[PDB]
Amino acid sequence: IFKPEELRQALMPTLEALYRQDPESLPFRQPVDPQLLGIPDYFDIVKNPMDLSTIKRKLDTGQYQEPWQYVDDVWLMFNNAWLYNRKTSRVYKFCSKLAEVFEQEIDPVMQSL
Structure with missing residues (x-):
C-alpha cells in the first residue's frame, strides 16, 4: 500500500x-x-x-493508488499521439523524444518503489 504524498514525491521528478x-513537451x-483544432476525427481514433x-492533476490529487497507473497514463499519452499523427510530424517526433526521456528515467524509480 502506498501513501499519496510518497507516491507523488517519488514520481513527480519523472x-x-x-x-x-523544450520544445518537445509543448504539444503535450x-x-x-478537437473542436478548436477542427479535427472531428480525433475522438474517433483516440478514445481515452x-x-x-x-497526469499532473491526477498525481497531485491522489488519483494514482499504484505506480503502474501513472505509467499507464504516460504510455496512453504517447500511444495516442503515435496512432493519430504521421510518423515524421512534429507531434510524433516530439512524442518519441518524451518517450526516450521517460524510458531512461522510470526504471530506477519503479524499482525503488
Whole structure:
C-alpha cells in the first residue's frame, strides 16, 4: 500500500523531466481540443485522451493508488499521439523524444518503489 504524498514525491521528478523538454513537451502540456483544432476525427481514433496537465492533476490529487497507473497514463499519452499523427510530424517526433526521456528515467524509480 502506498501513501499519496510518497507516491507523488517519488514520481513527480519523472513528470517534471517531461515538462522540461523544450520544445518537445509543448504539444503535450494541455489536452488536445478537437473542436478548436477542427479535427472531428480525433475522438474517433483516440478514445481515452491524455496529456501532461491531466497526469499532473491526477498525481497531485491522489488519483494514482499504484505506480503502474501513472505509467499507464504516460504510455496512453504517447500511444495516442503515435496512432493519430504521421510518423515524421512534429507531434510524433516530439512524442518519441518524451518517450526516450521517460524510458531512461522510470526504471530506477519503479524499482525503488
